[PDB]
Enzyme design. Sequence first.
Site, PDB file in Angstrom:
ATOM      1  N   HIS A  61       3.413  12.688   6.716  1.00  0.00           N
ATOM      2  CA  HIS A  61       3.515  12.263   5.324  1.00  0.00           C
ATOM      3  C   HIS A  61       2.448  11.256   4.912  1.00  0.00           C
ATOM      4  O   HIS A  61       2.319  10.929   3.733  1.00  0.00           O
ATOM      5  CB  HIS A  61       4.922  11.757   4.987  1.00  0.00           C
ATOM      6  N   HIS A  91      -0.724   1.905   5.799  1.00  0.00           N
ATOM      7  CA  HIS A  91      -0.910   3.285   5.387  1.00  0.00           C
ATOM      8  C   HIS A  91      -1.292   3.306   3.921  1.00  0.00           C
ATOM      9  O   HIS A  91      -1.354   2.261   3.268  1.00  0.00           O
ATOM     10  CB  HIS A  91       0.369   4.103   5.612  1.00  0.00           C
ATOM     11  N   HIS A  93      -1.063   5.764   0.081  1.00  0.00           N
ATOM     12  CA  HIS A  93      -0.357   6.760  -0.713  1.00  0.00           C
ATOM     13  C   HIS A  93      -1.450   7.151  -1.693  1.00  0.00           C
ATOM     14  O   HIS A  93      -2.085   6.273  -2.281  1.00  0.00           O
ATOM     15  CB  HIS A  93       0.818   6.136  -1.468  1.00  0.00           C
ATOM     16  N   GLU A 103       1.978   4.011  -6.083  1.00  0.00           N
ATOM     17  CA  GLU A 103       3.423   4.063  -6.230  1.00  0.00           C
ATOM     18  C   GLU A 103       3.810   3.072  -7.320  1.00  0.00           C
ATOM     19  O   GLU A 103       4.565   3.393  -8.233  1.00  0.00           O
ATOM     20  CB  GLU A 103       4.091   3.714  -4.907  1.00  0.00           C
ATOM     21  N   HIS A 116      -0.615  -0.052   1.780  1.00  0.00           N
ATOM     22  CA  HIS A 116       0.565  -0.823   2.145  1.00  0.00           C
ATOM     23  C   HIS A 116       0.400  -1.441   3.522  1.00  0.00           C
ATOM     24  O   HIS A 116       0.248  -0.727   4.516  1.00  0.00           O
ATOM     25  CB  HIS A 116       1.814   0.057   2.145  1.00  0.00           C
ATOM     26  N   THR A 195       9.519   2.729   0.296  1.00  0.00           N
ATOM     27  CA  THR A 195       9.345   3.767  -0.708  1.00  0.00           C
ATOM     28  C   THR A 195       9.595   5.168  -0.169  1.00  0.00           C
ATOM     29  O   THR A 195       9.546   6.141  -0.920  1.00  0.00           O
ATOM     30  CB  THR A 195       7.959   3.693  -1.336  1.00  0.00           C
TER      31      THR A 195
END
Length: 257
Positions: A61, A91, A93, A103, A116, A195
């Site tokens: 993911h 990581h 997103h 996010e 993050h 999240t």
Amino acid sequence: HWGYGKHNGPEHWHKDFPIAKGERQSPVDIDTHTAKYDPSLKPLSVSYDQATSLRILNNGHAFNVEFDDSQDKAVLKGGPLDGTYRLIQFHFHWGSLDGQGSEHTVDKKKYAAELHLVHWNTKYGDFGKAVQQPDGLAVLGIFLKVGSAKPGLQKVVDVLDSIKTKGKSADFTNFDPRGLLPESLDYWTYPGSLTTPPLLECVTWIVLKEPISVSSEQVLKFRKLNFNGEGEPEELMVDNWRPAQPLKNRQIKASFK
Ligand SMILES: NCCCCNC(=O)c1ccc(S(N)(=O)=O)cc1
Ligand SMILES: [Hg+2]
Ligand SMILES: [Zn+2]
């Protein structure tokens, strides 16, 4: 298994993780005109000088860069935090297009990606214990906007080829996370949660006001990763972000005015 597809995305999460509809879910939209400037907030103290990166891994993911958290090597303190928080991993997103990916949003504005930096409160012994406390984690969120290339991000970008599919990992030592920080440390803070499932509400979110710039080429390589494992049908790892959740009975505090 949960994911980001039409059939296993964020809107489906609540069925296996009821807390998805909790009282302090993240991410949230940051309304700059409603955020309360708090003069009691202390400046952030980021001490990444002794950081020890170990490995980079594609977990299906996103890709995580893991750090040695056996001792106070890379810690975060100050600000709204009480105690010392250890960096365990970081990581990103990102979206399929430059206009989406983050996010958290600012005045509804979405950024190309969001970094993050995950930390856990040391008074709890280990990460596993930290995720059972309302003040167990502290995640430092940094927005990424497309523009000039970020030199400190290149080493991460060059290794993506070897961790193309889910389950793959590569040695990733001697990486200095300080090369990913913006110039200013002004931030917004509010109590939230992870999240991604399990969506545990153990996080004190610290979102930095100033975004970092990354080149189109750098972001593009993020989009070449796969959600699937080797041998399985290819699925480009893009849009691995969760929509804004209701703020509810929470107040976002700003360390600046
Ligand atoms: N049992 C705890 C869950 C184990 C794996 N997940 C994490 O550790 C995790 C950490 C930070 C975020 S985020 N995206 O909010 O920074 C999301 C997930
Ligand atoms: Hg918790
Ligand atoms: Zn995250």
